Amino acid sequence: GPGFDFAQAIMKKNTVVARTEKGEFTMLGVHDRVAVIPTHASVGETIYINDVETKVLDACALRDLTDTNLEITIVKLDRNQKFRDIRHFLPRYEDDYNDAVLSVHTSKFPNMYIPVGQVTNYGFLNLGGTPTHRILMYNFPTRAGQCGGVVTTTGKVIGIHVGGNGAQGFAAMLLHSYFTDTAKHHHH
Ligand SMILES: *[C@@H](O)[C@H](C[C@@H]1CCNC1=O)NC(=O)[C@H](CC(C)C)NC(=O)OCc1ccccc1
């Protein structure tokens, strides 16, 4: 069946409730003090993490080389706790997946597992008015309150939930190379 045990281990050790001016989002911690949140959360200079105001030391809204939104924002947080390093659970490449789980961690839903079934590399989506790339699709009627939700199969953390049209849901891909130590460049 679905990898419920894996999703639960990821929720236990690597998720927190994040709250911006746009409301609450499940937030996946990736390594050290680096986490991700859907870009439409509109992250600013500070953010609530588990209802604790926290300094946002960096925020990078990912876009691809066509200058198209990827709907992922990576943040660096001023907190004492380190996140378990889960980078080795991220996919190297784009892919399709079987029998995935969507897990939510908010105030309203502290832990929440939804089997969404098959996940297809959808590609381009006009995501409520914003052209977006690298989208994963599942045939499940996801709802408000689920954004940021972590999409997993066993051994792989494959994306975070960003939208849904009433019949399908949509996640932004997570790729391993989003989080490697790289080069020295001016990004703001
Ligand atoms: C989470 O903030 C929320 C989840 C949507 C909401 C309804 N059901 C879901 O799964 N995301 C959005 O509302 C999202 C925000 C954009 C700025 C990314 N917009 C959205 O989902 O629009 C509906 C739609 C999605 C895909 C094709 C056509 C319409």
The CATH number given to whatever domain includes residue 100 is 2.40.10.10
> CB within 8 A of 181, min separation 6: which ones?
none
| Cα 25 from Cα 178, distance rounded (Å) | 20
Residue of minimum CA distance from atom 2 in ligand 1: 147
- Give the pair of three-digit tokens for residue 63: 């876009």
Ligand 1 centroid from CA 81, angstroms:
31
Q: Which of 68, 102, 147 to mutate to test the pocket of ligand 1 (most atoms within 8 A of CB)?
A: 147
Nearest residue to 178 (alpha-carbon basis) of 78, 40, 80, 61: 61
* Residue 19 CB coordination number (10 Å): 18
* Residue 33 CB coordination number (10 Å): 18
Side chain identity at residue 64, one-letter code: D
Nearest residue to 81 (alpha-carbon basis) of 52, 102, 103: 52
Ligand 1 centroid from CA 57, angstroms:
27
Residue of minimum CA distance from atom 28 in ligand 1: 165
Residue 155 lies in a domain: yes
Q: 100 and 65, same structural domain? A: no
Full domain range(s) for residue 45: 15-77
87, 155 contact by CB (below 8 A): no
Give 99's DSSP letter.
E
Phi, psi of 175 (to 5 degrees): -120, 145
What's the number of domains the chain is made of? 2
